[PDB]
Amino acid sequence: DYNTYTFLDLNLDLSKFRLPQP
Amino acid sequence: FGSLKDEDRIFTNLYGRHDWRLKGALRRGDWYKTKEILLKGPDWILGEMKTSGLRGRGGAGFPTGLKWSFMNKPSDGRPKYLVVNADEGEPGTCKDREIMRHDPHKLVEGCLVGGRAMGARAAYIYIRGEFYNEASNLQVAIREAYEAGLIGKNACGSDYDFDVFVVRGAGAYICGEETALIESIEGKQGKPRLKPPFPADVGVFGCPTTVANVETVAVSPTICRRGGTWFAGFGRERNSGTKLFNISGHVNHPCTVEEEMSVPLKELIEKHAGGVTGGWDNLLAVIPGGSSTPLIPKSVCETVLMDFDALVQAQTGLGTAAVIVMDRSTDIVKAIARLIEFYKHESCGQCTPCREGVDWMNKVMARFVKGDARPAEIDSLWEISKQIEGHTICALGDGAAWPVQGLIRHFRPELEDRMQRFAQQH
Amino acid sequence: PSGEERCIACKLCEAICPAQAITIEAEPRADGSRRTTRYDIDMTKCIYCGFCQEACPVDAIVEGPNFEFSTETHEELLYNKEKLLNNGDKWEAEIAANIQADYLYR
Amino acid sequence: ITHTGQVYDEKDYRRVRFVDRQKEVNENFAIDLIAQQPVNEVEHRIIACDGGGGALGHPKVYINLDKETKTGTCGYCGLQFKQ
Amino acid sequence: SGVNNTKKWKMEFDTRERWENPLMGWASTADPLSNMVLTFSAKEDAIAFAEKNGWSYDVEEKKVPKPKSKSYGANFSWNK
Amino acid sequence: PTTNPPTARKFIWTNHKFNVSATPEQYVPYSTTRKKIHEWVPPSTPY
Amino acid sequence: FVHRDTPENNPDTPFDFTPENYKRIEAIVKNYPEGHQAAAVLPVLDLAQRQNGWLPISAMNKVAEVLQVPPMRVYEVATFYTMYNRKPVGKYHIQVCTTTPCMLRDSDSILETLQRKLGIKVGETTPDKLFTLIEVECLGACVNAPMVQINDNYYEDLTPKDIEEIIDELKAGKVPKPGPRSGRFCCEPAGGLTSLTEPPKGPGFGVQAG
Amino acid sequence: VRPRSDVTHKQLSAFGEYVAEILPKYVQQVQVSCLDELEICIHPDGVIPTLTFLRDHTNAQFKSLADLTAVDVPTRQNRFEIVYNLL
Amino acid sequence: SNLIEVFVDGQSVMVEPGTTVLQACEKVGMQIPRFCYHERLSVAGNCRMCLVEIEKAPKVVAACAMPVMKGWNILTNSEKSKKAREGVMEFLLANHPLDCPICDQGGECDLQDQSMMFGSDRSRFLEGKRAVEDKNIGPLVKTIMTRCIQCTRCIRFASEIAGVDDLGTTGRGNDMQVGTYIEKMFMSELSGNVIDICPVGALTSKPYAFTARPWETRKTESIDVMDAVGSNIVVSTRTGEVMRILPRMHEDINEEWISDKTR
Ligand SMILES: Cc1cc2nc3c(=O)[nH]c(=O)nc-3n(C[C@H](O)[C@H](O)[C@H](O)COP(=O)(O)O)c2cc1C
Ligand code: SF4
Ligand code: SF4
Ligand code: SF4
Ligand code: FES
Ligand code: FES
Ligand SMILES: [Zn+2]
């Protein structure tokens, strides 16, 4: 079970971790 | 030879049975020497790859070490990058669906272990969009890892900074191609580029880039941990290591099991997986590497074994090592015919030889299944096949020609009879 | 048979005529179809080679059976589209029979 | 008058040519004769108009009748076909 | 895009009257040297023909496409 | 023609004619193309 | 591949990312290198589909604006890939895998079962628009050969009857246990593990020094 | 593709050399086409001498003149190319 | 310096590093049959009709896109590079609609000639052809696009020479049609050049639809007076009335292009 936005929203959550942009 | 030990297998979480999440992974001890390895440096890691003898593991089995090495040249002010293709489109391939779904972490540390080998700033994982649920599993895993600090700035205690991203595929087999994965990542249409500007030289976003089958990225941390020798020992000569084998179609227990590469084919279905449905005698043909590779008929098969050198001797490719088996209960003329239908519904159409050629073979193949076409047309398709084989911009046209060539090469009498059958009833 | 003239003004009947006899100028008809505004065979220039019969893709220009078309004045021999189309309508039945007999050979 | 509206002006002298003679024209005009033929309602997206009679007709061409609004017309016959 | 008709020099006489013909509407020309275009391999030889035949000449230098640098890599440039 | 009658195509003539050359029905050649260079007609309104 | 403007499917249908969706779009753009927002076309276009399954021409236009990319580009991506609907699609949108691996394990039967089960022919959708049947190509999950992708889920290793059961579950109620509805766990040897029978290994095992 | 015998392209070639040797004062070029035809080329002054040798030589009797023609290459300084074909 | 020596059939031409294989043949004087490669348009490699055979190499290379390398011998007329053209031309022609007596790029076809010169004499495509719905791209260009060989020179010009960026490829497979997804006219100056640049007669000029056929047109080289760039142009006249004005190349002023107004 997962929602249609799981991939995107999870990613947004990961944005904070995401290292600085180029 | 074969008979790899479970202990010496790489993805213990295969078939699940262990938490695909981090905890299970920690009991697996997948993240054990990651800081140390990266501390060793890019060169040492790439060196281990060479010692490993690890070939592609994806479609064409290029030596992994040398390939990755091509981007170990000094940065020219453009950030280098890592792209890990998980398209897993080749018909018959569920090989990759496992690592991604069952053992996402192995691939996460594969990414950073591989990353410092090429000095990549960041890695993008293109999992096919079809697998939405699969994506759900990996970024949960990726999220765990950063929370831990295993990836990101200060990666696992290393000054190395690596960021891992997941990109949505959109139902295209060609997206899988190395130059085309990039363009999809770039956001244009998924159309391959020519090789003269090689992928390392012109990267994604014009920044040096490298592309690896997810299996190839996943084994690199464990191979560094176990050392190239341990790994290189399992395989036969140039062909080395143990490659996962996915057997699907006309076998008693279709399953993906990793076994010593160079494992005899008659044995693969015999020992793991399950017996050929209807007895080994009921084996019309098998396509060892998936749809792209030519199928080999029964008399050739047990004699030959599954390693890339042995297969190229046999005129077939190890490829994704997806074993598809066809009992004597199947209309091969129609089996291969749907693979050509598989390629007309899928080739990008960028290049003239594949666009019209694959459609041309599809039309002839459909007539061949009916038997409407005359016997002389059969070698005509031979000639159409090699026109497509050497002239295409990418390898898919390479791939479309081979199954056609296999059907004519070993099953020419059967197609003639289908020719004959229709002519008789008029 | 419907009634649409066969010629579509590709103008290679003009290209292969050895004597420069056929003069064709065309423009898209109102229907939007391609058709020849002017098609003039100068029969005095024509040497009746029969290549035009050969060259036409739609086979619109044909060598008709009649040989008796001697004319009092030189101008009558010059033929525009209306005379040839009328010549075509008059001899269509025999032209169709003749082409029917010889097409397998060609 | 003629197929292309070729009508010598009231003052042109080539009309002298027609003096005491018939200006040859054909009553049967194609623009109209094709119209009479009805649109062929084929049931396949792409159909071919060999021209009628195969070798005795016009070069074979395939027409895309996909556009629902309009009807395909053979660049050769002018025959129209709709899906 | 073929360049096999841009190889040999040609000298062409000046164009002249092309009045419509009243009876059939065909183009009619009173200039004999109209359709004549002689082909000469080199500029020097063509100039010679004009001088000995006494026709006036105005030579136009050949203009050949300049070399153009092309490379498939560029189209995938980080910043173009 | 009686035995195997020909094909009728709803444009072919029913009354075929002989040489009409000396008779007034004769072809008189004429250009069927329309005018090519239309001209600027002078304004009829005095300026 | 031509969008003939229709009252339903044409820009009169206004499209705009819900405030939340726009937030999502921003993150998507962040992943890619700055100055390369265009790369987020596929991800963003998908989000649009998530919002509206139809993904009308208006949506494509919005994507373009959001990513400041030429409108044509969005069109190319949409008309190239196949996971984008470009038309209205059924609530369930089942897709049946019919490549040779599945067919060899009798995929055709499943499709036939669905055709009458659904009462709708392939390439078509039910009147209630609940189910749209499409003959899609290899969806991965080949090992569990008989397999179909209902919406996002992957129902695998299904015998004709199983689907009817699943479809009913979909028709009344929701979430019909998506996954391989057979005893086999994932892609294991159906009868018994041919390997990986023993417990997994431990950290540091057979590790070369450093 | 036409059938070609190299017997002739060899015979004729040799003769060409023979003529050239015997009449070196005028023969400029002597070629055999791919169509097995020899075409000695002579300085204009050698018109009388080269013909006479061919009309009256035991090893090369070329009694009749098939044709005398003059292609005109306007580009060529010497415009005309008088060609004499003998049998 | 910066002068590699590559052999085109052993002619030791020397070229700046960077020159493509097609370019190397040009300086010797040989011309690789080519579609989708225009000098002033980016290399795309779509047609693969230019496959040549560098010596001692397993596969044939793409002329227009392969940086030449030292030593290579091109073997342009090698038995192989002729099968590599006898077999491509088989494909372009297979899906082609034979309406050459409709296609007003009759004698102006780089696909019949490259077929009459570099291709085979017959066909083996006993199967059926395809048809692509036409498009009303504008009032100047008639796109009978069932003719298109998907060579993507339009999509390039419409993006690179002119900044329209509208024309694009739509779909994959043998029904990739290179037409505007929504029907938006290609309205821009520099528009008519697409006609001149599409070697196929898929999209051609609508005013000059069927008024002539190129062998007849007498071609007089003159100067553009509509605008002050003074672009060079060739006025194609038949029997004394101008039928078409198409560009003629002037490196400095109009390099193969002319405005929508002056044609
Ligand atoms: C049509 C086509 C489809 C492909 N699909 C895949 C795929 O699904 N997964 C994959 O790993 N490689 C695929 N490849 C091969 C890739 O282009 C590339 O060679 C490979 O991913 C390199 O990885 P490796 O270095 O690990 O072998 C495909 C190639 C072609 C021509
Ligand atoms: S007559 Fe035949 S060939 Fe001459 S134009 Fe009309 S159609 Fe083309
Ligand atoms: S383009 Fe027009 S002319 Fe060239 S081949 Fe196709 S049809 Fe005949
Ligand atoms: S239109 Fe002309 S240019 Fe554009 S693709 Fe089709 S053929 Fe190539
Ligand atoms: S073929 Fe249906 S799963 Fe790959
Ligand atoms: S010109 Fe070589 S790819 Fe088209
Ligand atoms: Zn027709």
Side-chain angles (χ1 to χ4, degrees):
Chain A
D1 62 356
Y2 286 119
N3 79 305
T4 68
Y5 287 121
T6 300
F7 173 92
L8 299 176
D9 302 9
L10 192 171
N11 193 335
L12 185 157
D13 308 346
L14 273 177
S15 172
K16 177 60 61 62
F17 301 82
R18 300 302 235 270
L19 189 152
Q21 278 69 213
Chain B
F1 303 112
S3 181
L4 179 63
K5 298 295 303 180
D6 298 356
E7 64 185 342
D8 272 347
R9 280 178 162 82
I10 296 183
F11 316 92
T12 70
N13 192 21
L14 179 55
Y15 303 165
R17 302 297 299 100
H18 317 93
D19 185 1
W20 60 290
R21 284 165 292 178
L22 186 42
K23 54 190 69 176
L26 288 179
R27 300 169 222 152
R28 294 193 297 274
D30 76 313
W31 294 90
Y32 179 78
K33 253 213 163 65
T34 312
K35 195 286 172 300
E36 296 72 9
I37 296 175
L38 311 178
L39 179 57
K40 307 297 91 180
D43 302 357
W44 172 87
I45 309 176
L46 287 185
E48 307 303 327
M49 311 304 300
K50 324 275 187 57
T51 72
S52 164
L54 175 65
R55 256 171 161 171
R57 284 303 184 274
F62 286 113
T64 294
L66 309 179
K67 180 182 189 301
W68 290 13
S69 177
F70 279 106
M71 78 178 321
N72 199 14
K73 296 292 184 289
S75 173
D76 301 354
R78 313 176 308 180
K80 298 192 189 64
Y81 272 119
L82 178 63
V83 175
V84 183
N85 67 349
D87 204 25
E88 198 184 351
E90 169 76 352
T93 310
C94 192
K95 188 180 68 65
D96 305 321
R97 190 164 187 264
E98 323 296 348
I99 319 305
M100 311 177 312
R101 170 185 52 176
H102 301 233
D103 190 355
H105 284 267
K106 181 138 300 181
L107 176 63
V108 186
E109 63 185 342
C111 293
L112 177 63
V113 159
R116 179 60 178 163
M118 69 193 88
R121 181 182 293 176
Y124 293 78
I125 310 181
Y126 192 77
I127 64 97
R128 179 139 53 91
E130 265 61 13
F131 314 105
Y132 178 87
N133 187 18
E134 260 66 22
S136 178
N137 304 139
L138 177 63
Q139 293 177 335
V140 158
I142 292 197
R143 186 226 53 232
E144 288 284 5
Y146 287 114
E147 266 142 357
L150 297 169
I151 35 163
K153 74 174 189 307
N154 289 337
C156 190
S158 70
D159 47 4
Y160 197 93
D161 286 358
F162 196 69
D163 183 1
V164 62
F165 303 104
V166 178
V167 173
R168 299 286 293 172
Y173 174 40
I174 190 64
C175 284
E177 204 271 349
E178 180 185 21
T179 55
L181 199 70
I182 302 179
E183 279 202 346
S184 178
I185 304 301
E186 274 181 30
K188 293 179 179 179
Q189 257 180 332
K191 275 177 180 322
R193 315 186 208 269
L194 277 66
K195 261 310 184 302
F198 285 89
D201 312 353
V202 186
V204 67
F205 302 106
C207 282
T209 309
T210 286
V211 178
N213 173 241
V214 296
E215 194 190 332
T216 316
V217 175
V219 296
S220 178
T222 59
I223 294 169
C224 295
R225 183 170 294 107
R226 212 75 174 181
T229 60
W230 168 90
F231 186 83
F234 297 101
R236 158 184 167 269
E237 195 195 359
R238 301 269 303 271
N239 313 343
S240 64
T242 70
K243 190 175 184 301
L244 288 62
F245 304 115
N246 189 11
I247 62 100
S248 47
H250 298 302
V251 296
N252 278 342
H253 296 301
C255 65
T256 319
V257 56
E258 55 172 331
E259 190 173 5
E260 169 183 344
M261 194 160 60
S262 309
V263 54
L265 180 53
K266 184 169 71 172
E267 167 175 345
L268 179 63
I269 51 195
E270 292 331 282
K271 183 185 193 301
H272 298 55
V276 182
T277 303
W280 194 87
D281 307 349
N282 289 5
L283 173 47
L284 194 162
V286 166
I287 60 171
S291 70
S292 299
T293 82
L295 61 80
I296 191 66
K298 183 180 68 65
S299 65
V300 174
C301 314
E302 70 290 350
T303 83
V304 173
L305 62 80
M306 296 297 103
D307 66 9
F308 296 99
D309 182 65
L311 287 209
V312 174
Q313 184 65 260
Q315 64 180 20
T316 184
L318 196 47
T320 77
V323 175
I324 293 169
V325 175
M326 310 166 52
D327 286 349
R328 303 291 178 175
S329 60
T330 59
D331 182 356
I332 184 171
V333 183
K334 178 59 163 60
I336 303 301
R338 177 64 180 86
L339 295 174
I340 293 167
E341 189 71 27
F342 178 75
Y343 292 146
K344 182 180 68 65
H345 287 286
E346 166 265 341
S347 63
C348 70
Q350 186 173 355
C351 55
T352 301
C354 176
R355 186 189 327 106
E356 284 76 347
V358 164
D359 211 356
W360 193 359
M361 292 177 182
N362 183 52
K363 295 180 182 297
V364 185
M365 221 61 215
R367 283 194 345 256
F368 275 178
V369 179
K370 292 189 292 185
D372 296 9
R374 87 199 52 111
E377 183 65 13
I378 308 164
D379 65 9
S380 178
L381 177 63
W382 187 261
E383 293 177 350
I384 295 151
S385 178
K386 298 183 71 68
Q387 294 300 320
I388 294 169
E389 212 195 315
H391 295 83
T392 42
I393 281 186
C394 76
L396 170 78
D398 293 345
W402 293 324
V404 176
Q405 261 159 322
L407 188 147
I408 300 158
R409 228 189 265 107
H410 320 288
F411 302 116
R412 185 176 179 83
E414 183 65 13
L415 177 63
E416 300 217 67
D417 289 345
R418 196 79 49 86
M419 301 297 103
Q420 184 65 260
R421 183 170 294 107
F422 183 77
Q424 298 270 316
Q425 64 180 20
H426 276 300
Chain C
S2 58
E4 198 66 18
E5 62 185 342
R6 285 177 177 268
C7 202
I8 61 171
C10 54
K11 292 174 65 175
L12 61 80
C13 49
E14 174 192 65
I16 191 66
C17 201
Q20 294 300 320
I22 317 177
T23 299
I24 294 169
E25 182 178 2
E27 293 177 350
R29 184 159 43 87
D31 188 19
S33 179
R34 182 170 193 164
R35 294 287 173 238
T36 61
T37 41
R38 178 220 282 140
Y39 192 89
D40 294 345
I41 294 169
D42 184 334
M43 297 296 180
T44 59
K45 271 200 273 143
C46 194
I47 61 100
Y48 301 81
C49 45
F51 295 161
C52 44
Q53 190 173 355
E54 299 302 320
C56 199
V58 187
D59 197 8
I61 178 75
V62 284
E63 293 283 21
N66 196 41
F67 49 97
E68 299 89 320
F69 59 88
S70 301
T71 57
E72 294 177 350
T73 80
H74 187 286
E75 63 185 342
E76 275 166 64
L77 267 204
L78 276 66
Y79 282 169
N80 90 313
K81 191 171 86 154
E82 260 315 294
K83 172 103 197 94
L84 295 174
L85 265 180
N86 294 10
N87 266 337
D89 273 13
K90 170 182 180 179
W91 301 92
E92 179 78 33
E94 182 178 2
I95 291 164
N98 280 20
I99 309 285
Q100 184 65 260
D102 184 1
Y103 86 91
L104 275 66
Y105 296 95
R106 42 198 73 191
Chain D
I1 300 188
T2 69
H3 301 249
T4 58
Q6 154 65 16
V7 63
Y8 276 116
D9 189 13
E10 65 176 10
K11 301 301 290 187
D12 299 355
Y13 59 100
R14 286 139 291 177
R15 215 153 67 172
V16 305
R17 288 205 290 264
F18 314 109
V19 170
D20 196 8
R21 277 176 301 268
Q22 170 259 5
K23 169 178 174 180
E24 180 146 359
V25 66
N26 192 31
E27 301 179 356
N28 296 132
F29 283 145
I31 329 176
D32 309 351
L33 294 173
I34 184 56
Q36 310 170 357
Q37 294 300 320
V39 174
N40 289 284
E41 193 74 5
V42 196
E43 313 306 336
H44 290 74
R45 303 183 62 263
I46 167 183
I47 185 167
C49 185
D50 181 65
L56 289 178
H58 73 66
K60 188 182 190 60
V61 286
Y62 298 70
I63 298 87
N64 195 356
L65 287 57
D66 193 9
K67 46 184 181 180
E68 71 291 341
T69 68
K70 303 165 47 59
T71 61
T73 58
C74 184
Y76 292 92
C77 312
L79 287 176
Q80 319 209 6
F81 325 89
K82 181 182 180 182
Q83 201 241 350
Chain E
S1 183
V3 73
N4 191 27
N5 285 358
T6 315
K7 288 306 191 307
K8 326 219 124 258
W9 290 70
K10 286 185 185 16
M11 66 174 282
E12 157 79 277
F13 296 67
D14 71 307
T15 84
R16 282 301 167 96
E17 210 180 0
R18 223 157 263 117
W19 71 89
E20 206 148 14
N21 206 72
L23 173 69
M24 295 300 293
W26 298 331
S28 310
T29 314
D31 180 44
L33 295 174
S34 64
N35 276 326
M36 185 166 64
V37 296
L38 309 177
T39 289
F40 297 99
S41 178
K43 176 175 124 194
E44 296 302 320
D45 309 331
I47 285 196
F49 214 74
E51 267 145 3
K52 64 179 180 180
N53 276 303
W55 308 309
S56 295
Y57 64 90
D58 65 9
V59 64
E60 327 200 302
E61 297 301 313
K62 184 177 186 181
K63 41 176 52 59
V64 287
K66 63 179 180 180
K68 303 172 179 56
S69 56
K70 318 280 298 180
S71 297
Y72 193 51
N75 296 132
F76 329 118
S77 287
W78 161 267
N79 192 31
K80 296 180 181 178
Chain F
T2 298
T3 67
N4 62 347
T7 63
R9 298 289 177 86
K10 68 179 285 292
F11 62 92
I12 295 161
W13 290 357
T14 57
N15 186 278
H16 299 291
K17 301 187 308 178
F18 34 79
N19 207 354
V20 297
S21 65
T23 58
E25 196 157 17
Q26 57 179 96
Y27 179 68
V28 295
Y30 63 96
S31 63
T32 299
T33 171
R34 323 177 63 179
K35 299 303 178 299
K36 300 160 51 184
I37 317 303
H38 305 272
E39 300 177 353
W40 176 73
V41 62
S44 178
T45 295
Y47 205 108
Chain G
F1 292 105
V2 166
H3 180 296
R4 315 164 194 62
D5 292 0
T6 182
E8 311 77 1
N9 182 1
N10 79 302
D12 190 1
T13 45
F15 184 63
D16 183 63
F17 300 113
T18 68
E20 187 183 9
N21 283 342
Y22 269 118
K23 307 179 312 188
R24 299 180 171 95
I25 305 303
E26 295 302 320
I28 292 181
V29 181
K30 305 172 69 176
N31 296 13
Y32 297 104
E34 179 64 11
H36 313 260
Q37 308 177 4
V41 175
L42 281 77
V44 170
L45 187 60
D46 179 27
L47 180 143
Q49 202 175 207
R50 303 283 182 177
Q51 168 89 1
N52 299 347
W54 192 308
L55 193 62
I57 185 66
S58 173
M60 308 186 195
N61 287 294
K62 248 299 181 178
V63 176
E65 178 180 7
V66 173
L67 306 177
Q68 293 71 29
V69 305
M72 180 68 209
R73 305 311 130 183
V74 180
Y75 301 157
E76 300 185 349
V77 170
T79 59
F80 179 82
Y81 302 92
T82 56
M83 214 158 55
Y84 301 122
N85 300 147
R86 303 199 312 104
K87 251 184 300 299
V89 70
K91 161 192 178 183
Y92 292 112
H93 192 202
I94 183 167
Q95 292 177 335
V96 175
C97 194
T98 67
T99 313
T100 201
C102 295
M103 154 176 90
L104 292 173
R105 296 286 293 172
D106 193 17
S107 70
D108 184 1
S109 172
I110 296 187
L111 182 55
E112 295 181 355
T113 302
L114 274 51
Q115 284 187 347
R116 65 182 181 88
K117 292 303 180 181
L118 275 56
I120 192 58
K121 56 184 180 304
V122 65
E124 298 283 0
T125 302
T126 67
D128 300 2
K129 308 308 174 57
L130 224 59
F131 297 84
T132 295
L133 178 57
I134 298 184
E135 184 188 5
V136 70
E137 291 191 2
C138 182
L139 300 171
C142 325
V143 63
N144 290 337
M147 175 277 303
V148 299
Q149 182 186 0
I150 314 179
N151 264 342
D152 295 3
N153 319 343
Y154 262 79
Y155 295 73
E156 311 167 356
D157 201 4
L158 309 174
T159 76
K161 306 155 301 305
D162 311 354
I163 309 100
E164 168 266 355
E165 171 263 9
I166 304 176
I167 303 173
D168 305 348
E169 296 173 302
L170 304 143
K171 291 174 65 175
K174 60 177 181 180
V175 201
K177 179 59 163 60
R181 298 296 299 278
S182 181
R184 68 154 51 185
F185 301 106
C186 285
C187 320
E188 66 190 12
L193 304 189
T194 63
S195 70
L196 298 168
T197 59
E198 69 193 18
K201 300 315 299 184
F205 187 48
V207 71
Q208 175 60 209
Chain H
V1 178
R2 176 169 304 272
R4 178 201 177 182
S5 64
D6 203 4
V7 186
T8 306
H9 190 270
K10 170 261 304 302
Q11 294 183 357
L12 285 184
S13 180
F15 180 58
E17 310 166 7
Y18 178 71
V19 176
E21 303 166 20
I22 302 291
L23 295 157
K25 181 181 177 178
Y26 310 107
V27 298
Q28 293 171 170
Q29 306 181 3
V30 178
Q31 61 175 1
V32 178
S33 171
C34 298
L35 305 156
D36 298 353
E37 302 182 356
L38 186 58
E39 297 191 343
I40 310 176
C41 312
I42 59 170
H43 177 86
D45 290 330
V47 163
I48 314 298
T50 321
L51 293 208
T52 44
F53 177 80
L54 303 168
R55 182 177 65 83
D56 309 329
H57 182 62
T58 290
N59 258 23
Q61 305 145 25
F62 281 115
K63 296 180 182 297
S64 63
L65 178 63
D67 176 27
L68 199 151
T69 312
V71 173
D72 170 22
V73 187
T75 306
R76 295 182 183 174
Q77 176 174 345
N78 295 277
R79 298 179 67 247
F80 322 113
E81 203 198 61
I82 310 294
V83 158
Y84 306 75
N85 304 87
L86 312 154
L87 171 61
Chain I
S1 60
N2 292 338
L3 266 190
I4 305 302
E5 177 282 310
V6 304
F7 304 90
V8 175
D9 287 356
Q11 302 311 326
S12 183
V13 61
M14 308 197 67
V15 293
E16 300 289 326
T19 61
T20 54
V21 162
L22 188 147
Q23 271 154 32
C25 304
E26 309 300 286
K27 297 183 71 68
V28 154
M30 296 297 103
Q31 200 182 192
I32 304 301
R34 66 184 182 277
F35 281 126
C36 55
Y37 168 65
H38 186 279
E39 297 85 357
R40 305 155 166 90
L41 279 184
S42 64
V43 159
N46 292 284
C47 71
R48 310 290 286 189
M49 168 47 199
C50 52
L51 287 167
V52 296
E53 194 177 29
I54 303 301
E55 192 163 0
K56 55 197 60 175
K59 67 174 54 180
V60 295
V61 303
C64 66
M66 267 294 311
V68 79
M69 291 186 56
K70 181 66 188 64
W72 285 9
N73 203 17
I74 305 196
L75 310 186
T76 168
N77 199 16
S78 165
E79 161 68 26
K80 184 156 178 185
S81 62
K82 291 186 282 183
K83 152 191 174 181
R85 293 169 184 170
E86 184 178 2
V88 174
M89 184 66 75
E90 187 179 0
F91 293 145
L92 296 174
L93 290 201
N95 280 108
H96 210 92
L98 62 80
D99 62 356
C100 285
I102 294 162
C103 186
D104 61 356
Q105 291 181 359
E108 287 170 350
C109 178
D110 199 359
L111 195 149
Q112 63 180 20
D113 297 348
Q114 276 181 345
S115 176
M116 170 94 179
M117 309 284 172
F118 308 109
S120 59
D121 315 335
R122 298 154 159 71
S123 181
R124 332 208 299 266
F125 190 58
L126 310 173
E127 301 64 28
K129 291 178 181 296
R130 55 176 182 183
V132 175
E133 284 299 359
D134 301 0
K135 317 288 173 54
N136 192 31
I137 193 184
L140 296 178
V141 190
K142 179 177 51 181
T143 58
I144 294 169
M145 290 199 186
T146 66
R147 294 182 183 174
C148 205
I149 53 152
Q150 285 89 10
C151 68
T152 79
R153 292 182 183 174
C154 55
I155 294 169
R156 279 170 278 162
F157 164 93
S159 306
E160 301 182 1
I161 309 306
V164 188
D165 60 271
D166 284 358
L167 273 57
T169 45
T170 59
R172 59 176 182 183
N174 220 343
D175 66 9
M176 185 160 87
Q177 63 180 20
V178 175
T180 60
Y181 177 77
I182 45 182
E183 294 302 320
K184 62 180 68 180
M185 66 174 282
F186 187 51
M187 189 173 59
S188 84
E189 70 278 333
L190 295 174
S191 179
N193 306 320
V194 195
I195 292 103
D196 295 333
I197 288 166
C198 181
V200 175
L203 61 84
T204 186
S205 64
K206 189 184 262 78
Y208 181 87
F210 303 118
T211 62
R213 179 68 77 193
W215 48 81
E216 216 170 352
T217 68
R218 291 178 178 172
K219 294 180 181 178
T220 62
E221 293 177 350
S222 83
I223 307 301
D224 187 1
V225 176
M226 296 297 103
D227 272 306
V229 63
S231 71
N232 272 14
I233 62 100
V234 165
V235 165
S236 306
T237 190
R238 261 197 48 219
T239 76
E241 70 281 5
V242 175
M243 306 258 83
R244 175 184 53 186
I245 294 169
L246 60 80
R248 64 182 181 88
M249 177 178 73
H250 189 317
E251 298 302 320
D252 317 327
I253 64 100
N254 71 300
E255 70 281 5
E256 257 152 27
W257 335 116
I258 55 174
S259 298
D260 285 345
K261 200 191 282 187
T262 184
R263 64 183 294 166

